[PDB]
Amino acid sequence: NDDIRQVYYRDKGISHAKAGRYSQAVMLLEQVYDADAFDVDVALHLGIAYVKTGAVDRGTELLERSLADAPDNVKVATVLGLTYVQVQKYDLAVPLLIKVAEANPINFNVRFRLGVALKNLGRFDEAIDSFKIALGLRPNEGKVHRAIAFSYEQMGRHEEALPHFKKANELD
């Protein structure tokens, strides 16, 4: 039968998604995804693959349905949170990325994107906090020194900004 074939496309699809083979994931997972037999692992992996292959609205919507179906799933909160940052819905990204950072404290990208979201919302002290954690993870990331410098500057904290601007220029 096709049911066992179907199981094979599903797992291979999910595995393409996880490896960053996003086009191949879309090709496989479109053939398995079923909206009235909803499987959150397929939905979440096809969802991020859509966002990555340019079908941003279609993917966001699958990610949002995944969030409705599985409110505690950290993988969904990861891909949806980072997608909201990519589309500038900073509002909606913050709660999601906080929860993921609490669950995976050495996920650098999540911590950084949380800092970015907070910054763009004008929550500079919170932003700074997240940027210091991001620098503890990767002390030589130029982009974090630049973001934290800007955030300290926005608050009038020039003394604290200055070595971060010097470091971003050293790593440049």
Written as one string, the DSSP assignment of 13-75 is HHHHHHTT-HHHHHHHHTTT--TTS--HHHHHHHHHHHHHTT-HHHHHHHHHHHHHH-TT-HH
In a domain, 1, yes or no: no
Q: Within a 10 A sphere around the Cβ of 153, how many other Cβ atoms?
A: 16
In a domain, 112, yes or no: yes
Q: Give the domain extent around 161.
A: 7-172
Q: Which two tokens stand for residue 79?
A: 């891909």
Contacts of 57 (CB under 8 A, 6+ apart): none
In a domain, 113, yes or no: yes
Method: X-ray
121: domain CATH number?
1.25.40.10
Amino acid, res. 32? V
The phi, psi pair for 66, rounded to 5°, reads -60, -40
Q: What angle do CA 44, 112, 87 make, to 5 degrees?
A: 50
Q: What residue has token string 């496309």?
A: 9
Contacts of 10 (CB under 8 A, 6+ apart): 28, 29, 32, 39, 42
> Counting beta carbons within 10 angstroms of the beta carbon of residue 9, is it exposed (0 to 12), middle (13 to 18) or buried (19 or more)?
middle
Q: Which two tokens stand for residue 166?
A: 């010097």
Q: Which long-range CB contacts under 8 A does 40-47 form with residues at least 24 apart? A: 40/66, 40/69, 40/70, 40/73, 40/76, 41/14, 42/10, 42/13, 42/14, 43/69, 44/73, 44/75, 44/76, 44/79, 45/13, 45/14, 45/17, 45/18, 46/13, 46/17, 47/79, 47/80
Contacts of 56 (CB under 8 A, 6+ apart): 50, 83, 87
Distance (Å, rounded) from C-alpha 13 to C-alpha 151? 41
Reduced to 3 DSSP states, what percent helix, strand and coil does the chain have, rounded to the nearest 5? Answer: 75, 0, 25
Amino acid, res. 149? A
Which of 21, 14, 16 lies closest to 40, judged by CA? 14
Which of 82, 142, 143, 125 lies closest to 107, judged by CA? 82
Q: What is the count of structural domains for the chain?
A: 1
In a domain, 2, yes or no: no
Amino acid, res. 13? G
CA 109 to chain centre: 7
Contacts of 123 (CB under 8 A, 6+ apart): none
